[PDB]
Amino acid sequence: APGASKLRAVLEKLKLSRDDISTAAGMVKGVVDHLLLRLKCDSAFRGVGLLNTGSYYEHVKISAPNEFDVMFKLEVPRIQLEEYSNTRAYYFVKFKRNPLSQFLEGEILSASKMLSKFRKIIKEEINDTDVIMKRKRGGSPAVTLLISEKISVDITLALESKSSWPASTQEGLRIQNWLSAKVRKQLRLKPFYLVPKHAKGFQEETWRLSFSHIEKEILNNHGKSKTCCENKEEKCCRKDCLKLMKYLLEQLKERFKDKKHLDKFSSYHVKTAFFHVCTQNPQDSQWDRKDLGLCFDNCVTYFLQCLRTEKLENYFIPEFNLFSSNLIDKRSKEFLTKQIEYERNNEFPVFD
Amino acid sequence: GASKLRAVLEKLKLSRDDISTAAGMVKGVVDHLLLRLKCDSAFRGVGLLNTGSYYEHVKISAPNEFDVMFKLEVRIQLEEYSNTRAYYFVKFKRNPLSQFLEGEILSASKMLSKFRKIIKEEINDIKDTDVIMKRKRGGSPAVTLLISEKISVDITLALESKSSWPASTQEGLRIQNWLSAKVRKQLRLKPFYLVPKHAKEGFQEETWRLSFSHIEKEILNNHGKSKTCCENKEEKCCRKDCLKLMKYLLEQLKERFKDKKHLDKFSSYHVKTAFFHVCTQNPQDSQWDRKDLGLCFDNCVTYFLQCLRTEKLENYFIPEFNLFSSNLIDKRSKEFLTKQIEYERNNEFPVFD
Ligand SMILES: O=C(O)[C@@H]1CCCN(c2nc3ccccc3n3cccc23)C1
Ligand SMILES: O=C(O)[C@@H]1CCCN(c2nc3ccccc3n3cccc23)C1
Ligand SMILES: [Zn+2]
Ligand SMILES: [Zn+2]
């Protein structure tokens, strides 16, 4: 059936912003490189570095040309984790043995003291850029840089641990039938990350698991075939389906911006649902470009099924339901369901 | 005739337990050496490389003999020797190894002597172990450890360089159609290694030779176009079994004819290099179906014979370096191996009986 041409028109429109996203990224890289070189001089942040994560390095940044999000990794001594209240994603951080001694509150690493020093040094080194404290986000992102005219950068601190992944991830990352058990094992040997994030008042000394570096690797190396999307015979529509899924939600959220019905929904929900769609459809032949219309339709349908059943487990932490009623109320999911179904039934007028 | 090739593969597995037990004994001795070496200021950054046929799962000979590479992280400047493409003098830009300098170049002889002396002193404190200075191998391997009753291990020292690969590698590693250009670029961001190896003029004694054994392992242990190659019944291929059979056939021919020197210069590295070229020429997993093992091995043998007849076998990473040059292997050797392999193939490999 006709319709995919409208999806292609949207993908063409998104490509027009590539050069403006590239020139603003080059300015961000300049400020960020200078920030890190000054941060490494502090004894607590000597092991600081740049994590090459986010939609920009995944080549799926499809809105906000002057809004970037960057992660600063910090290598830590051997970390011991203590799960917080069976949340499977939030942990207290302890140490087996230390430059971060000043930030201990008892025996746990205080996220409050780490953010305070992080925000203080950044404000001191920024002193054509200004700094803004990022509030109402639980600590991640911590700050927002304002660079030159209208460029903003959200900066997130992330502890790096080279230890085995926590037990709560043992059944996650179900890529064996898609990218192979060998790749799974190699991914699980990479470090994992922890960002400061309070858990709901709130417990303010918790850290949350982050696998943004794994998400980027899978997105940029997404086929069963190693030569997927490298020649005309092996072009797939995986990345374009993710792009359109993120664009659909962003255009809907802009459409209903004044009311908070879609406030709790995030590009991470679409990203997580997409990874599960890839697990359920591991063969490259199921993602052929001539079926771009079909594939996007099945992606929308899968995300619709997640909202109706109120189930969307974290791809890495299967016991963590991103769609739990403690996080997103039923009426919000029903509202998003109705609007997406309307769009799908009318060839997506949001894309006009 | 493919059933006899399967019989060989079956009988090769009987030695897996003996290989594993000896490998564990080697590891314990090797770990004691690395701890002693890391105490010296010149070798503070020494580490184990984990390469060779054991870690590639294609070890087919000498269950009690192993090859081990100690890597040493070094910012070096390379100066190619006599346009050889593979042999280099090592200089430094802008130093823990300054005791091994002779003028501006890093001396392989001076570094090997200190390497041998530390290992020899750390071995005298380990029971049922002795060390031998390896001769006539040009410095690599440097020593041979004797362990317990019949275990021996060759130890090679290797400088690690995290800089860009040398220009002689620019058009090597032609895996784009097989393992993808994305993987090729990832492999080339890894370090390269240099082993001490004298060059024939070996008459020039301060050269180092490029080594990519870590890259050969990655390819062999991740060999399919499909990431799930050999991970399920639908995607079982015969690539590694073909390599094992090629290695076994050459080794068996060398041992059968060791009373003469006709085959002394041939090495398993020649078979492995030809195999990588076979993989480049046949990139699809479908061309390596396990039901066609007899045909696949026959085509591998055929390709190796063609290299022998044409006297052409480029180093897989350095395409201008011909391993089958007349400066390295006499035409008489190639002719004798050709005739022997042809006779074997014609009568269903009686060498395996
Ligand atoms: O990891 C991050 O911080 C990324 C940037 C912020 C958004 N995001 C999320 N990651 C989560 C990781 C574990 C549990 C819940 C998560 N979650 C719930 C809503 C949004 C997220 C992705
Ligand atoms: O590199 C080593 O030392 C490995 C262990 C010894 C065997 N070998 C060879 N590598 C070479 C690398 C560049 C040029 C010629 C090479 N060559 C010629 C005959 C055998 C080799 C592999
Ligand atoms: Zn693709
Ligand atoms: Zn295979």
Domains of chain A (ranges, CATH numbers): 1-16+165-191+211-352 (1.10.1410.40), 17-164+192-210 (3.30.460.90)
Distance of alpha carbon B254 from alpha carbon B243, whole angstroms = 17
Q: Helices marked H in A127-258 — which ranges?
A: 181-188, 212-220, 238-255
How crowded is residue A24: how many other Cβ atoms within 10 Å of its Cβ?
24
Q: Chain A contact for B181, CB < 8 A?
A: yes
Q: How far apart are the first and last CA of chain B?
A: 13
User: Which residue among A179, A221, A225 places its CB closest to the CB of B225?
Assistant: A225
* Residue A91 dihedral angles phi and psi, to the nearest 5°: -140, 150
B199 close to B34: Cβ distance less than 8 angstroms: no
Q: Helices marked H in B104-221 — which ranges?
A: 108-123, 176-179, 181-188, 213-221
CA dihedral A114, A120, A122, A123 (to 10 degrees): 160
The residues with which B72 forms a beta bridge, in sequence order, are: B46, B159
Among A179, A180, A278, the strongest candidate for a mutation testing the B interface, having the largest count of B CBs within 10 A, is: A180
Q: Is B296 annotated as a binding residue?
A: no
Distance of alpha carbon A161 from alpha carbon A81, whole angstroms = 10
- Determine whether the interchain pair B179/A224 forms a contact, defined as Cβ–Cβ distance below 8 Å: no
Amino acid letter for position A274: F
Q: Is B271 annotated as a binding residue?
A: yes
Cis peptide before B191 (omega within 30 of 0): no
Ligand index nearest the alpha carbon of residue B68 = 2
User: Among A105, A44, A31, A226, which residue's Cα sits nearest to residue B284?
Assistant: A226
- Resolution of the coordinates in A? 2.2
Give the torsion sign (CA, A204, A205, A209, A212).
positive
- Strand segments (E) across A36-89: 48-51, 67-75, 79-83
- Determine whether the interchain pair A226/B180 forms a contact, defined as Cβ–Cβ distance below 8 Å: yes
Q: How was this structure determined?
A: X-ray
Q: Which residues have a Cβ under 8 Å from the Cβ of A341 and sit 6 or more positions away?
A: A304
A112: Cα separation from own chain's centroid:
23
A28 close to A64: Cβ distance less than 8 angstroms: no
Strand, helix or coil for residue B211: strand
Cis peptide before A141 (omega within 30 of 0): yes
A121: Cα separation from own chain's centroid:
25
User: Among B59, B69, B73, which residue's Cα sits nearest to residue B33?
Assistant: B69
User: Pocket of ligand 1, candidates A55, A86, A262, A322: which has the most ligand atoms within 8 Å of its Cβ, to mutate?
Assistant: A322
Q: How far is CA B3 from CA A345, B128, B245, B293, B349, in A?
A: 60, 43, 13, 9, 11
B282 close to B300: Cβ distance less than 8 angstroms: no
DSSP A189-227: TS-EEEEE--B---BTT-EEEE-HHHHHHHHHS--SBTT
**Could you tell me which chain A residue has the CA closest to the CA of B222?**
A182
CA of A239 to the centre of ligand 3 (A): 7
CA of B117 to the centre of ligand 1 (A): 55
B76 close to B161: Cβ distance less than 8 angstroms: yes
Q: Is B55 annotated as a binding residue?
A: no
- Determine whether the interchain pair B182/A224 forms a contact, defined as Cβ–Cβ distance below 8 Å: no
CA of B183 to the centre of ligand 3 (A): 14
CA angle A117–A120–A124, rounded 5-degree value: 140
Distance of alpha carbon B316 from alpha carbon B172, whole angstroms = 6
Cα atoms in the 13 Å half-sphere on the side-chain side of B137: 17
H or E stretch at B8:
helix B2-12
Distance of alpha carbon A54 from alpha carbon A1, whole angstroms = 34
Q: Token pair for residue A126? A: 């920024």
Interface of B with A in 151-180 (CB under 8 A): 176-177, 179-180
Closest residue CA from atom 3 of ligand 1: A210
Strand, helix or coil for residue A36: helix
How crowded is residue B229: how many other Cβ atoms within 10 Å of its Cβ?
20
CA angle A285–A287–A290, rounded 5-degree value: 95
Q: Which residues have a Cβ under 8 Å from the Cβ of A299 and sit 6 or more positions away?
A: A241, A244, A245, A273, A274, A277
User: Among B222, B225, B240, B215, which residue's Cα sits nearest to residue B317?
Assistant: B215
Give the torsion sign (CA, B83, B89, B93, B94).
negative
CA of B49 to the centre of ligand 3 (A): 34
B227 close to A224: Cβ distance less than 8 angstroms: yes
Does ligand 1 lie within 6 Å of residue A266's CB atom?
yes
CA angle A86–A90–A91, rounded 5-degree value: 90
A138 close to A196: Cβ distance less than 8 angstroms: yes
The residues with which A313 forms a beta bridge, in sequence order, are: A321
Q: How far is CA B119 from CA B33, B36, B173, in A?
A: 6, 8, 35
Q: Which residues have a Cβ under 8 Å from the Cβ of A46 and sit 6 or more positions away?
A: A40, A99
The structure tokens 């219309």 sit at A293
How crowded is residue A60: how many other Cβ atoms within 10 Å of its Cβ?
22
Q: Which residues have a Cβ under 8 Å from the Cβ of A316 and sit 6 or more positions away?
A: A169, A172, A173, A209, A211, A214
Helix axes B293-310, B331-346, angle to 10 degrees: 160
Q: Token pair for residue B284? A: 């699809």
The structure tokens 């990352």 sit at A173
B271 close to B246: Cβ distance less than 8 angstroms: yes
Strand, helix or coil for residue A339: helix
Distance of alpha carbon A119 from alpha carbon B96, whole angstroms = 39
* Shortest CA gap A18–chain B (Å): 21
Q: Is A229 annotated as a binding residue?
A: yes
Does ligand 1 lie within 6 Å of residue A89's CB atom?
yes
